[PDB]
């Protein structure tokens, strides 16, 4: 978060499994493995996406006939703010402890 | 896991934070010694290459997996069909040197010769990237250039790779929400 | 090693086949695992 | 005298004609937490209790290898089933009991079998089919099968909601004969239970 | 910095103001298998993780007293509202979190409460709120509240379909002021999760 | 040999019953790695084949017998003659992949190219029968995919290879009380 | 092991050659040698 000092804000981050619908409201998606943070003194908040798969690996590139996503959604929510309107929540994202790729192609890929 | 900002000290949170329990990684396939050491065709000039390294298609695995790296140090290994015999010469060497038989020469065998080269550059480490000139990368950094009557199919080989100070690497932008190319299926 | 796999021991000599290094007179690793975790919180049940 | 008191949660179920538990494949369920759910597992015992189902009236004119199959999980309105719509993956074993009362003076009999992976049967395969987790139900001898099978299939949890991994499959053998004393049909009954029960990742609310 | 994460189940919930859960009336749930449920009560610890919920806007015009109540269990549309479906006993705690997220430039204060057995509230008697399970929210401090309750009542199992032993109750102390850089209003939402779930005796299916 | 007849435990009954003595059995023959351990062939698509074991065609030895378990491993090893470069891409790769050389390309040498491929799908265990649906056996259930500018023949070899959960197999149904086939004669 | 049958050990490491299996954390076989066998019977000479 790098809004003003007097902006405040709780937001919300869930994790929907596939097989359902995605959330549009906090409340629903409250019954999904979510973490919930506010803005303060520490500026930044980070939180691991699981991984949760029937298999035990899972595909990096999308196929062209599967559409409906078949590893489930994130959704970032934003519960409440103060007087924060027009402030900005700069996201990052990297690899876990456990975040590991295998089996190398060339897939064109540029 | 909350944290201070602009700190940049990495901070890992693991799913522990919320129940759960990390897993068992392993890396072997990212591994840059690993991952770097394959073939990668590269489109030949008809008779004199150098070889250097950023003749690799960027877009390709080792083009671009090779541009990460602001430095690097490999042993090359090149693998060449051609016509007539194969004349390497080493680094910084007279291009009227192709010529000489001397030269590590390597007379004609089907279908292809595969040679090992050794790392020859008068630099400690290569680089994919100077800022001498703000393409336009200096003349020095190669491993040297081969000649033949006709050079058809050539094929680049990092051996050894160490790799120091990681540029950015991206990937094809997408215009829908999924890159959604067609998966080989049964 | 890389990717090598054989276990003969290799026909020519070393100084043949690579380039031989020279001492004089690893970093991203340890970054990563420097990296702080869990909580600055005062963790709740 | 062959009793045989089963019990799964708060449910019972005896019998007196037993012939005994088969179980099929494997006598314990194995790893459950597993690098594919990062621990997120958990075990929901509530779900572990037996539910009826009717499955065919066994008539006398059915001829051998008249089969019904019934795919598992099924339709199911309690506990078991509200976790199938509220958690995305799952494993359980199930725990079978097929009953087919007729009465001692009828004749002929029913094979019972939990097939994995069942889309439907070829007939010339029927003959083959003591091949999975089986018992006979045979009229003289006992009214019951009962068979246990464990969670089983190529990951270790599943989606239920696009997969079935077991087909219960009951099958007549030899024709129903009601002779004098036999009753003039049989209907064919099942009482199921989940057994080792486990959910992963939740869905967001039906709203 | 007084930071404090809380977790339920596969949930959390930091906050960087803490000032710290109060525990009304007891800081340890009491007996759970008595005499009155034969040992057939059972434990569903998925029911036990944080659900949202708005109460209110803190509107500048609110006067002193503007009180509102929200009795528990409500409407509820996931695991825990689907137990409250499927059995007929339960008991649980609470654990509460408001939050009124504003500014530092706003003043005045909010009240939280848990008070048992709240069918309205005279407004006399709103003066000494304070003897229920409490904290103040005021905007130059803090933005949550955070409070834990055991299951109280005069049995040691509810039917919630008929009793809802707690009302959480927000009450107006000051009234808000926006000043030059406060916020203009303040919505009120609580963060409210099951605590020590226990079950007896199910339902039939809904057919 | 008189046992409960529902009860479905195994019930073997030896010749001793009646005097006589069972004698010495050896099984090496029909043991699963051993039996399913040879060439099998396939007829491929002209050119873009994705490497399924249920390819294979469901009377032949390896075919059949593959598909009595319904869930199996092995590592794969095909053998394959081809015109130009034959190129494997692993399992789950974009088919556009197929064109890079980079992937484990093969290039031509008289008159048959073999290679063992590593298992790569990413369930535990495939399966060669699937009640997602009531052919139709998902695409994920595979060994990769190979292309050739045209593959004429295509051999499969299963090593390593576990099977689990015997199906039925069947024989060729006569009409005559003996299927009196014509033996091998000097 | 197999269908394999050499008596010199293979050139290739091992992890170049078979894919590498993984614990984590056989039944016919015991289910035909757990055959009852003989007679339920009192047996006559």
Same mark, same amino acid.
């Given at each position: 978060?790098?809004?003003?000092?007097?902006?405040?804000?709780?937001?919300?981050?869930?994790?929907?499994?596939?097989?359902?619908?995605?959330?549009?409201?906090?409340?629903?998606?409250?019954?999904?493995?979510?973490?919930?943070?506010?803005?303060?003194?520490?500026?930044?908040?980070?939180?691991?996406?699981?991984?949760?798969?029937?298999?035990?690996?899972?595909?990096?590139?999308?196929?062209?006939?599967?559409?409906?996503?078949?590893?489930?959604?994130?959704?970032?929510?934003?519960?409440?703010?103060?007087?924060?309107?027009?402030?900005?929540?700069?996201?990052?994202?990297?690899?876990?402890?456990?975040?590991?790729?295998?089996?190398?192609?060339?897939?064109?890929?540029? | 896991?909350?944290?201070?900002?602009?700190?940049?000290?990495?901070?890992?949170?693991?799913?522990?934070?919320?129940?759960?329990?990390?897993?068992?990684?392993?890396?072997?396939?990212?591994?840059?010694?690993?991952?770097?050491?394959?073939?990668?065709?590269?489109?030949?000039?008809?008779?004199?290459?150098?070889?250097?390294?950023?003749?690799?298609?960027?877009?390709?695995?080792?083009?671009?997996?090779?541009?990460?790296?602001?430095?690097?140090?490999?042993?090359?290994?090149?693998?060449?069909?051609?016509?007539?015999?194969?004349?390497?010469?080493?680094?910084?060497?007279?291009?009227?040197?192709?010529?000489?038989?001397?030269?590590?020469?390597?007379?004609?065998?089907?279908?292809?010769?595969?040679?090992?080269?050794?790392?020859?550059?008068?630099?400690?480490?290569?680089?994919?990237?100077?800022?001498?000139?703000?393409?336009?990368?200096?003349?020095?950094?190669?491993?040297?250039?081969?000649?033949?009557?006709?050079?058809?199919?050539?094929?680049?080989?990092?051996?050894?790779?160490?790799?120091?100070?990681?540029?950015?690497?991206?990937?094809?932008?997408?215009?829908?929400?999924?890159?959604?190319?067609?998966?080989?299926?049964? | 090693?890389?990717?090598?796999?054989?276990?003969?021991?290799?026909?020519?000599?070393?100084?043949?086949?690579?380039?031989?290094?020279?001492?004089?007179?690893?970093?991203?690793?340890?970054?990563?695992?420097?990296?702080?975790?869990?909580?600055?919180?005062?963790?709740?049940? | 005298?062959?009793?045989?008191?089963?019990?799964?949660?708060?449910?019972?179920?005896?019998?007196?004609?037993?012939?005994?538990?088969?179980?099929?494949?494997?006598?314990?369920?194995?790893?459950?937490?597993?690098?594919?759910?990062?621990?997120?597992?958990?075990?929901?015992?509530?779900?572990?209790?037996?539910?009826?189902?009717?499955?065919?009236?066994?008539?006398?004119?059915?001829?051998?290898? @008249?089969?019904?199959?019934?795919?598992?999980?099924?339709?199911?309105?309690?506990?078991?089933?509200?976790?199938?719509?509220?958690?995305?993956?799952?494993?359980?074993?199930?725990?079978?009991?097929?009953?087919?009362?007729?009465?001692?003076?009828?004749?002929?009999?029913?094979?019972?079998?939990?097939?994995?992976?069942?889309?439907?049967?070829?007939? @010339?395969?029927? +003959?083959?089919?003591?091949?999975?987790?089986?018992?006979?139900?045979?009229?003289?001898?006992?009214?019951?099968?009962?068979?246990?099978?464990?969670?089983?299939?190529?990951?270790? +949890?599943?989606? +239920?909601?696009?997969?079935?991994?077991?087909?219960?499959?009951?099958?007549?053998?030899?024709?129903?004969?009601?002779?004098?004393?036999?009753?003039?049909?049989?209907?064919?009954?099942?009482?199921?239970?989940?057994?080792?029960?486990?959910?992963?990742?939740?869905?967001?609310?039906?709203?």
């Amino acid at each position: 978060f790098t809004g003003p000092t007097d902006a405040k804000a709780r937001y919300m981050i869930a994790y929907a499994p596939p097989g359902m619908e995605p959330p549009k409201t906090p409340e629903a998606a409250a019954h999904c493995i979510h973490a919930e943070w506010d803005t303060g003194l520490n500026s930044k908040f980070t939180f691991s996406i699981p991984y949760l798969s029937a298999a035990d690996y899972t595909y990096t590139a999308s196929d062209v006939a599967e559409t409906t996503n078949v590893q489930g959604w994130v959704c970032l929510f934003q519960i409440t703010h103060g007087k924060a309107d027009g402030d900005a929540l700069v996201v990052l994202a990297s690899a876990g402890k456990d975040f590991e790729l295998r089996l190398p192609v060339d897939a064109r890929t540029q | 896991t909350t944290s201070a900002g602009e700190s940049a000290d990495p901070v890992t949170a693991t799913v522990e934070n919320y129940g759960g329990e990390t897993q068992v990684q392993r890396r072997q396939h990212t591994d840059v010694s690993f991952i770097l050491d394959r073939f990668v065709k590269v489109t030949p000039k008809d008779q004199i290459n150098v070889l250097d390294l950023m003749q690799t298609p960027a877009h390709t695995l080792v083009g671009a997996l090779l541009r990460t790296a602001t430095y690097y140090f490999a042993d090359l290994e090149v693998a060449v069909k051609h016509e007539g015999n194969l004349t390497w010469v080493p680094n910084g060497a007279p291009e009227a040197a192709l010529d000489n038989t001397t030269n590590p020469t390597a007379y004609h065998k089907a279908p292809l010769t595969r040679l090992a080269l050794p790392y020859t550059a008068p630099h400690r480490v290569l680089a994919t990237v100077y800022n001498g000139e703000s393409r336009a990368l200096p003349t020095s950094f190669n491993y040297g250039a081969i000649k033949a009557t006709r050079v058809t199919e050539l094929l680049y080989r990092m051996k050894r790779a160490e790799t120091y100070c990681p540029r950015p690497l991206l990937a094809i932008h997408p215009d829908q929400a999924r890159h959604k190319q067609k998966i080989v299926a049964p | 090693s890389g990717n090598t796999g054989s276990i003969i021991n290799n026909y020519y000599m070393q100084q043949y086949q690579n380039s031989m290094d020279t001492q004089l007179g690893d970093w991203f690793s340890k970054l990563a695992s420097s990296a702080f975790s869990g909580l600055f919180g005062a963790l709740l049940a | 005298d062959r009793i045989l008191t089963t019990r799964n949660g708060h449910t019972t179920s005896t019998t007196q004609s037993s012939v005994g538990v088969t179980y099929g494949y494997a006598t314990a369920e194995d790893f459950v937490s597993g690098p594919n759910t990062s621990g997120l597992e958990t075990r929901v015992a509530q779900a572990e209790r037996f539910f009826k189902t009717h499955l065919f009236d066994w008539v006398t004119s059915d001829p051998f290898g @008249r089969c019904h199959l019934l795919e598992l999980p099924t339709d199911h309105k309690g506990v078991y089933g509200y976790l199938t719509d509220s958690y995305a993956y799952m494993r359980n074993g199930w725990d079978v009991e097929v009953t087919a009362v007729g009465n001692q003076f009828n004749g002929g009999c029913l094979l019972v079998a939990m097939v994995p992976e069942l889309c439907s049967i070829q007939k @010339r395969e029927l +003959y083959q089919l003591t091949l999975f987790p089986h018992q006979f139900i045979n009229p003289r001898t006992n009214m019951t099968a009962h068979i246990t099978v464990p969670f089983v299939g190529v990951n270790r +949890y599943d989606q +239920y909601k696009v997969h079935k991994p077991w087909t219960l499959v009951v099958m007549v053998v030899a024709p129903l004969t009601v002779n004098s004393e036999g009753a003039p049909q049989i209907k064919v009954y099942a009482n199921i239970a989940p057994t080792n029960v486990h959910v992963a990742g939740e869905f967001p609310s039906k709203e």
